[model samples]
Target: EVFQNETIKQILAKYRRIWAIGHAQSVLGWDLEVNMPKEGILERSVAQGELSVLSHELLLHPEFVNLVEKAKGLENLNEYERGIVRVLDRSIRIARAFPPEFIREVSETTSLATKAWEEAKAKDDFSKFEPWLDKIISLAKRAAEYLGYEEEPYDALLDLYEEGLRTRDVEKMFEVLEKKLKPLLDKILEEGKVPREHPLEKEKYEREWMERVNLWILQKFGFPLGTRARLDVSAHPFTTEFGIRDVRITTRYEGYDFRRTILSTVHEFGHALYELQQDERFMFTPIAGGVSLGIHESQSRFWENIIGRSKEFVELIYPVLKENLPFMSNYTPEDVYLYFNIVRPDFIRTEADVVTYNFHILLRFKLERLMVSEEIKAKDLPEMWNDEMERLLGIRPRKYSEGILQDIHWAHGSIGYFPTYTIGTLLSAQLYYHIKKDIPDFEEKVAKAEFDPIKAWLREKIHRWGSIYPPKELLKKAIGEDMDAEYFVRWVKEKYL
Candidate 1:
């Protein structure tokens, strides 16, 4: 049902502009990663702070409060109208909980912290980034306090990214995953079954050729290049959408390891696909994007691993590699799949293959929960990280850079964000399983470079709804159940074991 009420319509108009401001913020973030020099941090922080303040204030604006209340009492409001009201009501509650000044401060600190993180990671020094990490922890704790939770502080932070999620839920999920992961991983490592030396090795491929290969892959995946989206380079790979029409993705090239860039591209492009496929009607509205990061990451990991790592996919793309680069002729798709499916201990979470990847996330989640609960301090990070590296993967980081300072999440004050990676991993498998059931020839279609069917299927089931349904309802509507690990476990056994 569409809203005929002028007040609701007007409020939605203003909400759309608020999201436009948010889109601008996304661009600035993209620019900071892709184009801006280190010297621009101070200036960039001001822009970030301004946008943060404006967004917070707008959400808490008295007019918005009045309009949302007005929206609730009306029976004539459409589902779109109700979703807008629902998203804003939640946003406003969170906004009012923290002062805009505090919100802006957190934003500014994170802007500079990202720069400091890059430097510290480069220098392999934990001390350089320790102070920034301290500030972020303190800020996140305060933000959590303001949000308030029934059980614990971490739940407050976790709820911010994935609504209704709890610390206990993650702990429980990890318990289940660890049970399955340990044996599977032990079997892979003990038997000498896992590939040794990543099959996609240290071979130099020019950035130009790598970009050409990535674009070729994306285009065949049915991602339109010029109009709906564009791909660029960044220190970290990411996807940002300024509404459906202007979705953008970025990747960083490691000249020696070409798979890193391409897979990152595929990952980010998966994210891009979600945004690009959202119904255009929701473009300017409050519910105009992903319902949660977990849902969003499902798409990324789906493309990055399920599709990108499939033997069939490897076969399909091997020709592209040979056609585009003279050096890649030495590599075979079989070896690439072996590398893609490599099950081993890894220091970097993003580089970890499926078997060990969730373990990295579980480790991070456990540590961050401790930090937020005041059980650990910033100075304790390296020690905490080292112990986990030993425990989770039976390996240790040679330096702080490879261990504690590897991720940019803490620098940006994203506490409780790590668990969503696991959630997405599980969700991706669940979605793929359902997709295969619905389309029995799913792998055949994927192998033959027929992606339109897959895209069309995802558009109806996942992307089109936008934030219309809450995450549980959305997943339930499409997959007939809430998030579960059974699907993922079966998937891992089939692919890796």
Candidate 2:
């Protein structure tokens, strides 16, 4: 009933087949991260490769291509129909650009590369993962060549994640971000009241208590655990969806740092919330999920930073921690809040605090452009990473695990994906600026643990539309403004200073 456009109907039939294969790939990916054994990589990689090949073939099928072209020529198509045509056209063009062998090899190699990264990171050795990363970078270059770019090879790859993003645009945003963030960080580091070291950081709590507290927070935040969605543990926190209804998120538990599990859970929950909140009528179509990685990250970052780290959220959740976590008996709500908001430089990107997070992304943005342009190879990454860390944050990583090997993106062949984190972080603050203006009692609702108003607002403004509109247009429509670093900068000054 959602589709009255005949061309769209045919395209949907064809697109759903490819979507089904992707659904399988995604579910398997979630399983691999959450439950698979170390030795299972061989079989899983083969299966993934074949599925990717099949999806590529389906995407490029003559009938499917004809349907997409037909829809593009039609004038009466609705926004969602136009979206399908645009999304499928891009996918099909890329599929045609690369040889099927390249597709399969990239899939298979990245599969093995992710496994290699886990091993390398665990042992704090970059040599173990370097060879695989070399291959990944080479493959990414080939991909960029095939996709073609107007000015830089990295632009083509950047477009793959954020659709219409370019190297220049990223640099423009980062330039503004660095100008604002550095001075703000200096002010905080100079005279901020928060301490980098907290007693809770040294105290070890039981994993069971951490899990219990995280689940309680998730439920309070409206994440449907063990129902429409579920949570599991993984090496890195992530979210994946088999369908809008079958969303999954993962977080790791470390007894020494309780916020690691809780905050990661909240972050991944934000991602799952976007998927689970999409319009069901768009299910099985190309428009069924988040529009772009930048928009997707906006959802996650909004919840993780704007909401999860807020004073009101701390006030709401501290009692749960106080009752369930015995160690919480020693700390007040303000102490817990201060610990959560500690603005310190960290070697790991995920562990970096709000103030210094974009610095990590800026480092990656610079290095990824270099890697894609063939200016630097995998061997150069560790040293470059260490130097950049020291230069940017005034601290250098002593271990590969703390630096180059920290992120799973490169091993997964996600070279151009890092920029979206900073993009989303800025966008999150933009969304927050509007949300607070619209809901004047926003902090009151958060303090009272009334989350439905917030969720309802996000669903209305963001989630329910899915990928029906382009990311920039979607943000413009929601916030009445384009992406701006000023909102984020303003928010940081208000929150941290």
Candidate 3:
């Protein structure tokens, strides 16, 4: 019936054209990150801006809007059809709200903002990126006004990423997490027997060996390297999908602490697997990819923290490390496990331990809300960030790069996206709780490096559905409950204590 519906057919056909432009934009965007030279920003930014306008125009075309409305009024529509209308309705409404010039301006400014951010982060100077950050926040504020919100401007921007997420909900989540996790963190610091240091930090591995080992671990974890998915190096690790069949992920090489490379690779593999495992029939359509960033992050955090950091995973990978890199001779499996699971407060959010990672997100969540609300400016950010780090993690960043200039999100005009990291991390725990009950011998399988059953379980339960269901509904269907911070707090106590 869905295939035969004329409204659905026209909507899909029109969306494919928009998706094609987005696909090219994604490829060019990936190249900008991984391969494009710094000098290419001028022409690349113009091209990206043009593509953004074109895609916006395509989405806002009268024919497409009429078809979307027609589909919305149809009776007995399936979930896929409803999803098509729902996603397109939102897109069309947004595209209509913002002028084409506004879209182009944002695209071009953010393209250059990313370049400025890279320079600032490298120089450890926030002044270089401060203007761009200011522009991004102002643009984001205008975007919020354009999108129109019932409660606050931040709510509209938050909805852009996570469907129904809002500022108050984020505050409540942080409140619950702080209430539950801070005591555990203090207890762990006092009596958790955490190591002061390890050889994993002291040792440096060759970049070549690190890259080779990273690919090996990803392939072993069931990421289809060189087939449906590929990995590369970038300033920040991320996953992008052109379609269900072509997903790309990247990580950086620090030449020291192989965990940074390997765990980042594992983290990205978790994201790529979600794309690679998604139902292909939805390709080039509104429902083709992840329902939201929160669900998407859940996949990465699930693998990176829950599976990749586990005792069984260390036991499984130690021998591989011994064979691949000669440095493993200095550490036992227990040492590797402890090294992987260290609970320490850190300035860098990306390198933070799972126990303290979301605190970083909470701080960012607060600052973003303030910035979007026009209560903070770029000049004030560095001190605010440092003070927040001290308040939450009991440590302060010594450099601007480690503080206000660290993340690439603000440079990319991602104002309301930070909270989703904490949301997704909590969801990962909820999903982990279900995985334990659903897959008996889950640890045994990890110990033996038998990830096929685990991957299959996730693919069946979560990935294969794509965006056919809204994020909350999809999660509820998978775990039989809404997302709760308590699951993560419980998991932390069970594992870290």
What are the models' TM-scores?
A: 0.93, 0.93, 0.93
**Cα error of candidate 3 at position 161, Å:** 1.5
Backbone clashes in each candidate structure, one number apiece? 1, 0, 0
Please identify model 1 stretches exceeding 4 Å from their true place.
Answer: 35-45, 104-120, 128-135
* Residue lDDT tens for model 1, 1-497: 35467777888777876887888998898888888989998999789978876887787788878888888777877788888888878888887888758867987899889999999999998888898988998898889899999899999999998987899889887887888867877887888876856746767878888888888898888787888888888777888887688899988878877778878889998899999998887667877788998999899989888898898888888898898878777767777778666666878886787888898998899888988897578898888889998988989999987898888889988899889889999999999988888789988998999988898888899999999888877888887888887778888888866
State the local distance difference test value for candidate 2. Answer: 0.88
Worst 10 residues of 3 by lDDT: 190-199
TM match of model 3 to true structure: 0.93
The lowest-lDDT stretch of 10 consecutive residues in candidate 2 is 190-199
Give one digit per residue, the lDDT tens place, for model 2 in 166-224: 89989888888778878989889988577776788887888888888988998888788
User: Measured by TM-score, how close is model 2 to the native structure?
Assistant: 0.93
* lDDT tens digits, residue span 333-363, model 3: 9988889888888888877888899999998
lDDT of 2 at 10: 81
lDDT of residue 132 for candidate 1: 92
lDDT (CA) for every model shown?
A: 0.85, 0.88, 0.86
